[PDB]
Amino acid sequence: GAIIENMSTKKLCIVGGILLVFQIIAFLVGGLIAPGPTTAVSYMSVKCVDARKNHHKTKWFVPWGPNHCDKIRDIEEAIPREIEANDIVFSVHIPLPHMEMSPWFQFMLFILQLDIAFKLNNQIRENAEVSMDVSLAYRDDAFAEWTEMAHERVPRKLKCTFTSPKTPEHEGRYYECDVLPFMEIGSVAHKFYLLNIRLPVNEKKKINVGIGEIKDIRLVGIHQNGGFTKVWFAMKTFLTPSIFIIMVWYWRRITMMSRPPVLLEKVIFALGISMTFINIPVEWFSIGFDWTWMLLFGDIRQGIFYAMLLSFWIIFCGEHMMDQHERNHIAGYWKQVGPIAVGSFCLFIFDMCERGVQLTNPFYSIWTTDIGTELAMAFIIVAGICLCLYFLFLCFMVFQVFRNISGKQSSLPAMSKVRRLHYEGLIFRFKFLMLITLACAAMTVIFFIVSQVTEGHWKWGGVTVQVNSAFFTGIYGMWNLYVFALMFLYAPSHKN
């Protein structure tokens, strides 16, 4: 007998009221205080000319400010000055003038967008690839030499189309090229970063030949807003004490009983631990230590919760068939849980492949070669099939539960007070959670669609509301609150 089966309809309404008030606050904080999730800043590179100086004495080229490079304003000016390919390096200073990076920025994503001209003598070949020679440095203060962070080679394929007719009238028009991935850094620990890209040409090896005429390179830097991180941490700090206390209350209720615990109780508690793991501000060390592994941690933690939530739903349904069941062991649901273990395992490998190599080579992409693409898709496809099998076995489980309920709720006159109240409770307990779970899922999906299609913010009077932010804080709070309700309402009822 769970607590939810002994609460009157009145008492449940009071609890619901309290839970709703908190849910409203969660939205208000994200919308009205947080600045919004992320910012993207566009950069244009400067074309610096090396006067045949850089051999082993790495000289870092600074786009602007004191000790700036000798730069060419337009690539065509190279020809009258006899400047050859390989003598021009593209320099970008990541923070803009009179701006700094701070540890509160959690990551940086970098993408490149090439501006390639059409000329009849310089067209893009069918299998055109760009081989970038890329070096990155960091600096902590203005009056210090740049210190190297990474030096790698970054081949990328070109995907470009030309929509005008290819005739001698439209020369000078640009290709329409897609976005190329470039770099992922999982930590922001230094104030300044300097990026130098060179494009060497070698005729006998077809290295950067037949890649068209390249005139400019654009870079976009994406980072999470500092104010969003600060608000997010404050929210997690609030939640952790609350989760800790209820976890301890729940534990003591389970163990101080006249009967050993049952399987559903063990699963509900285990789901509590997974949420406690995602609510701990482990990230509040990212502002003091340069730990590049925090982005993969975040993913693993979040992925575990998903697995636990999907498993809970299976066990819950399996624990509420009336006749023929009330089974209590883990070893016999492997028919319904297997698909989850396989799917999560395969996604784990996929993320580990992309994320783990990023930790050792910031200029990595699993989608660089045909073989990498084939394997990456194989893991996604398997995960997708397993998730669909999960959805079909959950639906059958539910179907069978309901037909059993229709039977049990019919042959009621011939049992006694003790057995009748027992089953009437189970019937209610089941129906209640199903309606709440569907409402929670429906709200999450509908608001993901209103975050992926709308503008991102709404200006209404003197107040600007952040919609993408309110999404994250509201849903984050919602599932934790739902787990809080689950542990309180479904704990054993104390009787004397």
Added chain:
Amino acid sequence: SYPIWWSLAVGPQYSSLGSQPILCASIPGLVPKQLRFCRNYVEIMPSVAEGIKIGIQECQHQFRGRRWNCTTVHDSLAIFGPVLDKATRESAFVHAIASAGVAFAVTRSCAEGTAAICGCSSRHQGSPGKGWKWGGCSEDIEFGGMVSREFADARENRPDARSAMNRHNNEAGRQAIASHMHLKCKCHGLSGSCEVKTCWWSQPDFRAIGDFLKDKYDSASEMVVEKHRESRGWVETLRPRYTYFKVPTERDLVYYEASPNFCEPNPETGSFGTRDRTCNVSSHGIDGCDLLCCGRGHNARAERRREKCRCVFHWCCYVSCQECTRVYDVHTCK
């Protein structure tokens, strides 16, 4: 022309892209509003002169075979000559492309980090204030529009029929850029799935903007001048011909005076002759150059030009290949 400071793009320009800090000294067409700007926004002033230069190169490309080629006289006190003293179709284009050029050049220069006064600048902001270190600097995309509307449109508020034309066409340039920006999005999240999408707008190439305004040039409407005021006086405004046609706003070009004849030299109308021009150099068929010369007998010149040939043609510059000569037949008119 009609605006004088456009002359900064020619002659004295001499690549004054920040290495020549000539501030509010040479700007030849300047009102009190422009003086305040050029004194407060000094780091971005070289980008305005470059923006005009860009517009000049584009109009000369776009009109290379239209009798009127966008000619720029050496006087530098009137960069295109008297041809732009009338409210004609050619002026509408030059105004729109010049306005677009300034906004374009300023935005690119800010993206290169050439100025610390461009848009957002702050090294600190915890207490919530939409600063770099709390909320992000998202206002940097409107700066180029501010410079073009603040500096260029400073003499255009005088109550005159021509002033109305100029204001409309200058906005057409700025709107042409805004209408052609592209939206790109990067998908990232738990596993790369689109839980966080980050989107940005990118600038178009200027060739597309040139072509757009060239189409609007040919489709440009005729307006008539109407005058009234409440108090004793007149203010001149334009009345579009909405009896048959459909004139819009922030998309199109307007005019109200007739274009001149460009066939023969005429010093009073600012018209340069086409007596010495070439033809059959494009498709070598039938093209606008058949009317360009306004004459007949396009057969006068042979050439033996030297060019580089048999080359590898690398992705950048100074290919360093062999020379050869070719014989050309040029259908030059008299």
